[PDB]
Amino acid sequence: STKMQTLHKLLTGEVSFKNKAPVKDCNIVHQFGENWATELSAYAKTLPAEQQKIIVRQIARVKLTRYTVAELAAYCGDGPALLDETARAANIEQGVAFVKAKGVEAFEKYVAEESTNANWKPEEAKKFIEDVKAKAK
Amino acid sequence: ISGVSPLLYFPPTTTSTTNREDQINKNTNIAIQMIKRYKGEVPPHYTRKSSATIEQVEKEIDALLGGAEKLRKTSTDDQPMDKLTLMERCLRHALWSYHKEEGRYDFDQIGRWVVYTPEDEVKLAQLKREVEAKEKLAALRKRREEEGLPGGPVPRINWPQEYSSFIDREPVVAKRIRYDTLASTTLERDEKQIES
Amino acid sequence: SKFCAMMDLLEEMQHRNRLKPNEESWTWVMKECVKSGQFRLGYCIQQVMETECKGCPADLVKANEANAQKAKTEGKEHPGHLSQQAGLFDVKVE
Amino acid sequence: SKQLTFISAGATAAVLQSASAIVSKVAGGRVQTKTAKEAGRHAVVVGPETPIGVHTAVTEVPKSAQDPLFSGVSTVVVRAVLPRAAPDSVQLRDALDVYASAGIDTKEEVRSATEAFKKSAEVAVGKAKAKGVKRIVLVVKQASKHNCINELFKKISTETIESAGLTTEVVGTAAVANQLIVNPESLGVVLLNDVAATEQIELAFAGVVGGVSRVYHTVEGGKISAGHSFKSVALAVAQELRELGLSSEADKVEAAASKNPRAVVSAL
Amino acid sequence: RADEVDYTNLPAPKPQKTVWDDNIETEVLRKYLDGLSQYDMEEAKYGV
Numbered sequence: 137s138t139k140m141q142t143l144h145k146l147l148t149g150e151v152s153f154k155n156k157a158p159v160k161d162c163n164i165v166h167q168f169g170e171n172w173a174t175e176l177s178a179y180a181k182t183l184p185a186e187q188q189k190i191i192v193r194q195i196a197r198v199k200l201t202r203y204t205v206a207e208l209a210a211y212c213g214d215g216p217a218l219l220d221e222t223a224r225a226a227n228i229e230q231g232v233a234f235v236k237a238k239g240v241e242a243f244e245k246y247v248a249e250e251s252t253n254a255n256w257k258p259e260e261a262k263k264f265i266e267d268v269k270a271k272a273k
Numbered sequence: 274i275s276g277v278s279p280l281l282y283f284p285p286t287t288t289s290t291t292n293r294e295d296q297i298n299k300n301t302n303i304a305i306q307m308i309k310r311y312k313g314e315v316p317p318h319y320t321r322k323s324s325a326t327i328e329q330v331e332k333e334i335d336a337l338l339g340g341a342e343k344l345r346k347t348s349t350d351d352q353p354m355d356k357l358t359l360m361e362r363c364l365r366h367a368l369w370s371y372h373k374e375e376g377r378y379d380f381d382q383i384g385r386w387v388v389y390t391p392e393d394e395v396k397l398a399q400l401k402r403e404v405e406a407k408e409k410l411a412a413l414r415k416r417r418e419e420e421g422l423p424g425g426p427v428p429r430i431n432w433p434q435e436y437s438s439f440i441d442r443e444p445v446v447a448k449r450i451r452y453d454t455l456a457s458t459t460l461e462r463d464e465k466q467i468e469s
Numbered sequence: 470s471k472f473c474a475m476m477d478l479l480e481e482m483q484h485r486n487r488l489k490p491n492e493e494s495w496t497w498v499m500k501e502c503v504k505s506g507q508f509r510l511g512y513c514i515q516q517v518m519e520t521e522c523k524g525c526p527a528d529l530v531k532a533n534e535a536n537a538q539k540a541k542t543e544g545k546e547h548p549g550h551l552s553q554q555a556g557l558f559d560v561k562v563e
Numbered sequence: 564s565k566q567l568t569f570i571s572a573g574a575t576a577a578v579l580q581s582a583s584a585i586v587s588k589v590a591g592g593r594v595q596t597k598t599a600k601e602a603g604r605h606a607v608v609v610g611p612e613t614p615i616g617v618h619t620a621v622t623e624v625p626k627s628a629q630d631p632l633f634s635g636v637s638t639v640v641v642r643a644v645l646p647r648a649a650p651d652s653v654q655l656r657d658a659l660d661v662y663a664s665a666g667i668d669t670k671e672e673v674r675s676a677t678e679a680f681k682k683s684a685e686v687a688v689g690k691a692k693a694k695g696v697k698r699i700v701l702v703v704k705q706a707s708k709h710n711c712i713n714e715l716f717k718k719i720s721t722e723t724i725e726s727a728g729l730t731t732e733v734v735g736t737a738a739v740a741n742q743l744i745v746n747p748e749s750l751g752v753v754l755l756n757d758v759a760a761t762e763q764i765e766l767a768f769a770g771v772v773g774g775v776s777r778v779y780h781t782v783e784g785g786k787i788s789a790g791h792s793f794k795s796v797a798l799a800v801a802q803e804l805r806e807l808g809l810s811s812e813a814d815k816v817e818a819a820a821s822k823n824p825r826a827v828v829s830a831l
Numbered sequence: 832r833a834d835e836v837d838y839t840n841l842p843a844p845k846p847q848k849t850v851w852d853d854n855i856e857t858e859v860l861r862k863y864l865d866g867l868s869q870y871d872m873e874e875a876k877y878g879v
Contacts, residue, residue, distance in 0.1 A: 142838045149746045158741030162276045162441045167838050197694050197745050200771060201280060204443045205740055205879070209611065209766030213792025214824040215773050216632060218852060220279070224838045227280040234283055250281040253436040255274055264281065302651055310667045399554065409544050409855045416542075426856050426864065428849045431849075439844055444875050448849075460860075544855035554860070705877050708870050737878030760879060 140179040143168055147176075148192035159204040162164075173199075231268035240269070274436045274445075278465050285450050286457065293424075301463035307428040308467065327371065334364045361364050362386070376468070416463065429454060471501050482489060492522045499529045508537040565594040565807060568602035569805035574610030574791070582609055582796050583829045589812050590804070605807065607799050611766055611791050615647045618679050619780035620755075620762075620789075621685045622769050627817060628798060630773030638747050639690045642684035642755040642765045643716070644678055644779075656757045661709045668686035673715065679757075680716055686780060687754045691729055696731035696751035701765075703756045705735045716756040740764045742773055766791060774824060776802055794824035846864040 145151035146159060157163060164172055173195055180191040200208070200216055202222070211222040233241045244265065251261035338361055345357045354362075365386035373383055380401050388394050420423065432449060439445045477560055482488045495518045502511040512531035518525040540546045566587060571579055586596050598644045622644035624633065645655045653661070659676055662669045701720055703713040708827045721731045736758075741819050742749060744767065753760035769775050774794035779787045788803045790796030801816035815831055823830035832865060849868045851857045 138835075139838060145631045146838075149749065151839065152738055154837070155843060157841050158737055159745055160441065160741060163841060165276045166440055167841065180686075194631060194745070200275070201741065201744050202696070204446065205763050205767045207280070208289075208744075209791075212767065212770035213774060214770070216771055216796040223279055227283075230283040231281070236670075244814065246283075247281060249433070250283075251431055253274065253578060254278040254281055254442075256277060256281070258275075261281075263641060270461075284592055304651060306653065308666070310662070359841060402554075406855060406859055410859050413543065413855060416484075424859060426851060426854075429852050435847070438844075438847065441844070441877075441878075443879065444844075445872070446565075447879070448871060466689060501834075545853060549853045549858045549861075552860070705873065706870055707873050708866065735877055740879070 139168065140176065143172065143176055144180075144191065147198065148190065159198070159201075161198050164198065178246070228264075228268055228271060232271055235268060237271055274442060275440060279441055282446060282449060285453050291457075295458050297461050297463060300459075300461060301466050304462045304467055327368075327375075333366060334368065338364070380404075423456040424461065425456045426460075427456050471557050472498065472505065472507065475501065490521075492518070495522055496526060496529070499525065499533075503529050503532045503536065506536055508540065511536075566604040566605060567594055567596045567803060567807075568604060568610040569596060569598045570600060570606060570614045570787075571598070572610040572614045573612035574697055576659060577790075578609050578793065578796055580792055582607065582790075582800060585797060585816065586800055586804075587831075588828060589800075589816055589831065590809075591721055594807060603781045603786060604785040604787065605803065606781070606787035607789070607796070607803050608779065608787060608789045609796055611762070613644055613762065614779070614789075616781050616783070617644050617779040617787070618646070618782055619683050620765060620777060621686060621764060622775060622777040624772055625664055625798075626774060628740065628773055628821065630771075633747070633772050636747050636772070637694070637752045638743070639687075639694065639752050640743070640755065640768055641683065641687045641690065642750070642761055643720075643757050645679045645757045646782075656712055659715070660709060662713050671813045676712070676715055677719055679725055680719040682752065682780075683791055684720045687720075687752060688724055688727045688729060691752040692727075694751055698728075698732055699724060699752040699754060700750055701731055701733045701754050702738065702739045702761060703733060703754070704737060704758045704760050709756075709758060712758075713756050713758065720754060735758050736764065740767070743794055768797065774798065783814060792824075794820050797824075797827045805824055844875055846872045848872055 138207070142151060143164075144185060146153075146164070149159075153159070169175070176195065180188050183191070200212075200219070203212075204217070207223060208219070211226060212219040214222070231243070231247075234246065247261060247265050250256075251258070256264075338357070341357045345356065345361075348358075349355070365382075369379075369383050369386045373387070378400070380397070382398055385407065388397060414424065430452070432445070435445055435448070436442070479490050479494060479498075495514060498520065499511060499514045502508070504513055511529070514560060515525045515530055515533070537546075569579065569582065583596060586594075590596075595757035601614065603616065608617075613620070622640050622642075624636050624638065629636070648654060655672055655676060659669060660670050662672065671731070687699055691697075701717060703709075703716060705713075717733060721733075724731045739750075739753065743753070747768075755765060765777070768790065769777055774792055776795055776799035777789040779789050781787060786806075788799035790799035797816055801813045801820065803812035803814065805808040818828070819827040849871055851864050
């Protein structure tokens with residue numbers, strides 16, 4: 137009960153972090169858990185409609201916060217709903233340029249290293265590398 | 274680095290064609306602008322009262338001091354000096370000050386005919402290190418260019434460790450962007466125009 | 470450090486066991502100094518072999534000199550912070 | 564007969580071509596569309612980069628183009644823009660902080676920066692008074708490098724605002740950016756000092772809201788529209804046409820931008 | 832059933848000062864490189 141109450145206050149802005157750190161997706165994931173969104177959504181159902189709407193809105197904004205400021209400015213120019221596809225396309229274009237610049241085997245190793253540092257599932261990394269390879273030809 | 278990131282970091286190389294000449298030209302122009310501001314205004318022009326070259330003056334000085342070599346007598350540093358010694362010291366001091374201002378950094382004679390104060394010795398030592406350092410830097414920047422390594426400095430970092438250390442990727446990605454950009458630029462100016 | 474371990478081992482052998490190191494032991498030390506790039510320890514070991522043993526393997530002496538002159542070209546002859554000019558009140562005493 | 568001035572600052576050719584097609588198809592040829600690098604009125608600037616001749620960089624949340632996520636939010640983000648010199652020349656924002664370290668005199672540059680900040684502060688307080696807020700939020704990057712430009716920015720912005728009678732709260736860049744993206748309803752008017760990071764924050768806010776057109780106030784006196792994406796540029800053109808005195812065309816462009824952001828030209 | 836955890840508490844991001852290789856190019860740029868490291872640490876502490 138306390139965790140959900142703390143999370144709701146944190147997202148609403150009533151409750152600040154110890155060091156007044158920004159309320160980003162990464163920090164929340166670090167403390168509350170990987171699936172904080174799911175448990176919060178289930179908990180919100182036990183609250184009036186207004187609080188439910190606020191929780192949904194705050195969750196959506198936090199998800200948008202998962203990108204850096206530069207990425208948002210570059211890719212979120214034409215709305216947030218189209219942000220994910222635009223970011224994915226730009227990343228794919230970078231992958232194509234990398235492949236055309238320094239081969240494939242190095243690109244395969246580079247993608248693997250970034251995925252390890254980027255906290256990416258092997259399936260997602262494999263899908264990305266296949267997509268960029270297919271885009272090349 | 275908790276949290277699945279949306280994108281895999283890739284080199285920020287987007288200006289595929291950035292000629293080294295243009296970068297060094299811009300560095301030169303900025304360097305010239307800063308130098309002009311620091312110095313201020315070019316000093317008012319001066320017209321020479323007499324025409325003579327530095328080489329001619331040095332030759333005349335050598336001729337003047339060569340005829341008195343037999344008469345010239347050495348003595349202890351604390352002992353009083355002679356007319357020939359005083360003339361030699363003054364002439365050589367002026368000559369080597371002019372040479373050092375011009376650019377002929379011959380420290381062997383400058384340390385002899387210009388050093389008379391501990392502050393002067395400190396200034397000479399500071400100058401001596403600087404010239405040698407620039408010569409070494411230019412040589413290795415040339416030897417590095419021949420090899421093909423990036424012109425700019427590269428820090429001794431292990432980004433896989435940095436990703437693990439930091440929690441949020443944003444500062445880490447920003448740091449990589451800066452250093453990658455720095456390593457892809459030539460922090461060199463045209464020293465012909467600067468000297469001019 | 471490999472060099473430190475071997476020197477300590479020699480110290481144990483000569484002092485606490487009363488056994489004189491032979492040429493083979495010193496050659497191993499010199500090889501490690503050359504391999505690790507520590508060209509100043511090589512000079513000291515070179516004299517040790519020239520003093521206790523009979524000379525040094527001239528292959529290794531030349532290798533060490535090559536490493537030293539590489540540093541001179543690259544400027545890594547001494548740590549740089551030592552070369553920085555300091556003063557009475559310009560030194561940070563931690 | 565009439566003229567619309569298109570400025571390009573770091574914008575891809577696709578966006579500029581899209582803007583030209585939109586204006587040509589909507590206007591119908593009555594108003595010509597010329598391209599330049601500086602203007603004071605009837606100007607649309609395309610691209611993240613700041614054009615030459617702009618001192619204020621205000622941006623708001625238009626009611627019509629509010630994204631469903633950010634429905635009801637009302638916060639005005641004004642970025643102070645110092646005079647822009649040629650790309651090769653050292654910019655004032657950097658000269659004001661490096662010359663002091665080098666010991667060079669910094670009198671004229673300080674005077675120019677002071678004038679720009681005063682104008683930006685006057686714009687910010689006017690917006691704050693119009694909206695009715697009592698306190699504004701200054702944003703200054705807390706990096707050690709920018710220890711002089713920000714100091715002057717605070718010294719002047721607070722002076723002007725306090726002279727006007729409103730309160731000022733100073734903050735950094737990361738905290739304000741997170742607040743503006745997550746909880747923007749707690750900020751009424753936020754001024755931003757002239758730094759690259761602040762420019763990115765302004766663009767991110769203009770994009771996250773759903774795509775809007777930024778207003779630039781120039782030295783000559785006036786307002787010019789600014790966009791960086793298809794939707795933002797389309798809204799900027801729609802506002803510009805409205806200023807010229809075209810209402811139906813402006814509404815059509817706005818509706819097309821709302822419906823089909825990336826392909827407004829074909830949508831309308 | 833005692834206290835479990837302060838979800839509010841967050842471990843501060845422990846900064847690390849960047850270290851440059853000791854070459855002649857570093858000595859010439861010692862002041863400039865040091866400024867970059869100071870800027871990097873300031874960014875890490877504040878966040879951006």
